[PDB]
Design a protein around this motif. Structure first.
Motif, short mmCIF file in Angstrom:
data_model
loop_
_atom_site.label_atom_id
_atom_site.label_comp_id
_atom_site.label_asym_id
_atom_site.label_seq_id
_atom_site.Cartn_x
_atom_site.Cartn_y
_atom_site.Cartn_z
N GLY A 195 0.83 -1.22 0.00
CA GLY A 195 0.00 0.00 0.00
C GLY A 195 0.85 1.26 0.00
N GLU A 196 0.20 2.38 0.35
CA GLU A 196 0.88 3.68 0.27
C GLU A 196 1.67 3.97 1.54
OE1 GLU A 196 -1.23 7.75 0.74
OE2 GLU A 196 -0.61 7.62 -1.39
N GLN A 197 1.01 3.91 2.68
CA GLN A 197 1.61 4.27 3.98
C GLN A 197 0.66 3.83 5.06
OE1 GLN A 197 1.37 8.41 5.18
NE2 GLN A 197 0.14 8.76 3.28
N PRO A 198 1.16 3.63 6.27
CA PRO A 198 0.23 3.38 7.40
C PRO A 198 -0.64 4.60 7.53
CG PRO A 198 2.43 3.99 8.25
CD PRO A 198 2.57 3.73 6.70
N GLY A 199 -1.89 4.37 7.95
CA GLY A 199 -2.79 5.48 8.29
C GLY A 199 -2.91 5.66 9.81
N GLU A 223 -3.09 2.36 11.76
CA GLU A 223 -1.84 1.59 11.68
C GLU A 223 -0.69 2.23 12.44
OE1 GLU A 223 -3.86 2.56 9.05
OE2 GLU A 223 -4.60 0.49 8.56
N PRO A 260 0.18 -3.02 9.32
CA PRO A 260 -0.51 -2.42 8.17
C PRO A 260 -1.94 -2.90 8.04
CG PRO A 260 1.00 -4.22 7.48
CD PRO A 260 1.12 -4.12 8.99
N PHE A 261 -2.74 -2.07 7.37
CA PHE A 261 -4.11 -2.40 6.88
C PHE A 261 -4.96 -2.99 7.99
CE2 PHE A 261 -2.26 -2.01 2.52
CZ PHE A 261 -3.21 -1.14 1.97
N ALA A 309 -9.88 0.61 5.30
CA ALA A 309 -9.32 0.07 4.05
C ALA A 309 -8.88 -1.37 4.21
CB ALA A 309 -8.10 0.91 3.60
N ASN A 318 3.96 -1.35 2.95
CA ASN A 318 3.62 -0.04 2.39
C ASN A 318 4.86 0.58 1.78
OD1 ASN A 318 0.76 0.53 3.06
ND2 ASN A 318 1.52 0.05 5.13
N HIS A 329 -6.42 1.21 -4.99
CA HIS A 329 -6.27 1.20 -3.54
C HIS A 329 -7.60 0.90 -2.84
CE1 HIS A 329 -5.28 2.29 0.51
NE2 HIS A 329 -4.00 2.34 0.15
O1 LIG Z 1 -1.41 -0.01 5.89
C1 LIG Z 1 -2.12 0.78 5.26
C2 LIG Z 1 -3.43 1.24 5.69
C3 LIG Z 1 -4.12 2.11 4.91
N1 LIG Z 1 -3.63 2.53 3.71
C4 LIG Z 1 -2.43 2.06 3.19
O2 LIG Z 1 -2.00 2.43 2.10
N2 LIG Z 1 -1.74 1.19 3.99
#
Ligand SMILES: O=c1cc[nH]c(=O)[nH]1
Ligand code: SF4
Length: 206
Positions: free
Chosen positions: A50-54, A57, A63-64, A68, A90, A177
């Motif tokens: 994915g892109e990054q922890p939110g 997270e 992650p995730f 999402a 991510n 995504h």
């Molecule tokens: O780990 C995560 C959670 C949400 N969105 C992401 O791109 N990665």
């Protein structure tokens, strides 16, 4: 440059994850709670990025785990893929965020291409460590991290890609995504969910 000097010479995921806790490869470590490394084991055949922890997270350390992630789990289950067998990470490992007055959460901000390139040594270490047969790239930031800054996820749906500068030359599959599927008109969300399941099945069939 970037994170490279912070990455230890080891493929052990626990040791990589510890070292990422100490990374200062870009500015994002300052305001984030902790680095969020990938989750799963080195036997995984499928890596998902994915892109990054939110917000969730950044505090769970995994992650995730937020809305999402729940949508992704529903798609994985519909694709007959076991999340426990994957390695999920991510492109960027520290949450980049702001808050709005009256907001109910910290809002993610898009990592710059500079930050993505700074963090990519870690993705390369994860890929070297796991040796996945296929990498699923969830959304624009992750896909561009491996496929180039001009790459358009929307133009290559369903396609098995291979690029020469990716460690071990795994198959790559770029898809929407899961956050994109959380909102919008019902018919649009349902068509988009089916297309995510399709892309996950392409990857799992590699
Ligand atoms: O780990 C995560 C959670 C949400 N969105 C992401 O791109 N990665
Ligand atoms: S986002 Fe990546 S490169 Fe930047 S400080 Fe965090 S782990 Fe290091």
């Amino acid at each position: 440059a970037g994170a490279q000097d912070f990455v230890p010479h080891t493929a052990d995921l626990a040791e990589l994850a510890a070292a990422a806790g100490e990374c200062r490869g870009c500015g994002l470590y300052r305001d984030a709670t902790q680095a969020v490394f990938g989750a799963g084991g080195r036997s995984a055949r499928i890596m998902m990025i994915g892109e990054q922890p939110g917000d969730k997270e950044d505090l769970a350390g995994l992650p995730f785990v937020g809305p999402a992630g729940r949508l992704l789990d529903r798609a994985l289950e519909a694709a007959d893929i076991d999340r426990d067998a994957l390695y999920v990470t991510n492109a960027v490992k520290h949450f980049k965020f702001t808050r709005a007055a009256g907001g109910k959460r910290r809002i993610s901000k898009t990592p710059s291409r500079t930050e993505v390139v700074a963090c990519r040594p870690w993705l390369i270490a994860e890929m070297t460590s796991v040796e996945p047969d296929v990498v699923v790239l969830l959304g624009a930031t992750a896909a561009k991290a491996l496929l180039g800054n001009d790459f358009r996820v929307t133009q290559h749906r369903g396609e098995v890609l291979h690029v020469d500068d990716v460690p071990g030359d795994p198959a790559l599959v770029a898809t929407v995504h899961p956050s994109s599927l959380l909102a919008g008109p019902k018919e649009e969300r349902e068509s988009a969910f089916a297309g995510l399941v399709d892309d996950l099945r392409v990857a799992a069939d590699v």
